[PDB]
Design a protein around this ligand. Structure first.
Ligand SMILES: Cc1ccc(-n2nc(C(C)(C)C)cc2NC(=O)Nc2cccc3cc(C(=O)NC(C)C)[nH]c23)cc1
Length: 256
């Protein structure tokens, strides 16, 4: 990927190692691809420059249909990591904007797609630690992609073991994933929006849970409740949750 083939438009935000730019990449075909161009401050340590590159190293190896895509890497100074963006933006903003036209089967489709992405990460014992609708992009009205645009706390999405002891496992991600589904079925509503972060653990310890979103099928809410078991061992694996969500999707397809 050549630097002249990438035009920068505006600052997307500040990453951990430097600014992230929203740009456009013109390929060999001439078609314009929306991209996020991640940069690293010059004054960083070699250790910090290495940690910056690890995203390019890992992301190059990821090719899952429901995971964000790496477009390329420009190693020559200033080093850029180019990731694909889509014009439909974040899922949270997309859900809010299309709340009146989106059908429940589509919300179950998105839930299943993220579950498939997470079942793959589970296969390689990798933990996301920040499963939330803000970390999901809309590739098309029928395709969502999981990413990680956060800085390595998201209290309102975290399992009790993550809040209490900073323990993060695949089991804790399963909890976060059900919170992500609650956001999808609620059309982008923030979980526990009515609480402060300090109040969350007290409510979970007492046995209180996020209520069923109006449009959420009872079977899907039961699955959400199993992911929110205080005991991490009693939550399903993403691998089996794919089977569970595929059954829910087929029942919703049969209803619609
Ligand atoms: C070090 C490290 C960091 C992250 C990851 N990692 N792991 C995964 C899973 C495998 C899905 C968990 C995905 C990712 N990376 C991305 O999704 N990158 C990405 C893609 C598209 C756009 C943006 C914007 C930013 C950004 O920094 N925006 C600031 C403005 C905050 N990042 C983007 C791996 C290693």
């Amino acid at each position: 990927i050549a630097r002249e083939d990438v035009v920068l438009n505006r600052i997307l935000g500040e990453g951990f190692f430097g600014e992230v730019y929203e740009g456009v990449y013109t390929n060999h075909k001439g078609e314009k691809i929306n991209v996020a161009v991640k940069t690293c401050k010059k004054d960083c340590t070699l250790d910090n420059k290495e940690k910056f590159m690890s995203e390019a190293v890992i992301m190059k190896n990821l090719d899952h249909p429901h995971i964000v895509k790496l477009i390329g890497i420009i190693e020559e100074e200033p080093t850029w990591i180019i990731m694909e963006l889509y014009p439909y933006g974040e899922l949270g903003h997309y859900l809010e904007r299309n709340k009146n036209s989106l059908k429940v089967l589509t919300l179950v489709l998105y839930s299943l797609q993220i579950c498939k992405a997470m079942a793959y990460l589970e296969s390689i014992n990798c933990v996301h630690r920040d499963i939330a609708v803000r970390n999901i992009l809309v590739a098309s009205p029928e395709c969502v992609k999981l990413g990680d645009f956060g800085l390595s706390l998201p209290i309102k999405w975290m399992s009790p073991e993550s809040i209490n002891f900073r323990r993060f496992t695949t089991a804790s991600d399963v909890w976060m994933f059900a919170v992500c589904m609650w956001e999808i079925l609620s059309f982008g509503k923030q979980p526990f929006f009515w609480l402060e972060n300090k109040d969350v653990i007290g409510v979970l310890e007492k046995g209180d849970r996020l209520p069923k979103p109006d449009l959420c099928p009872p079977v899907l809410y039961t699955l959400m409740t199993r992911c929110w078991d205080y005991d991490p061992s009693d939550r399903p694996r993403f691998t089996e949750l794919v089977c569970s969500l595929s059954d829910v999707y087929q029942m919703e397809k049969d209803i619609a």
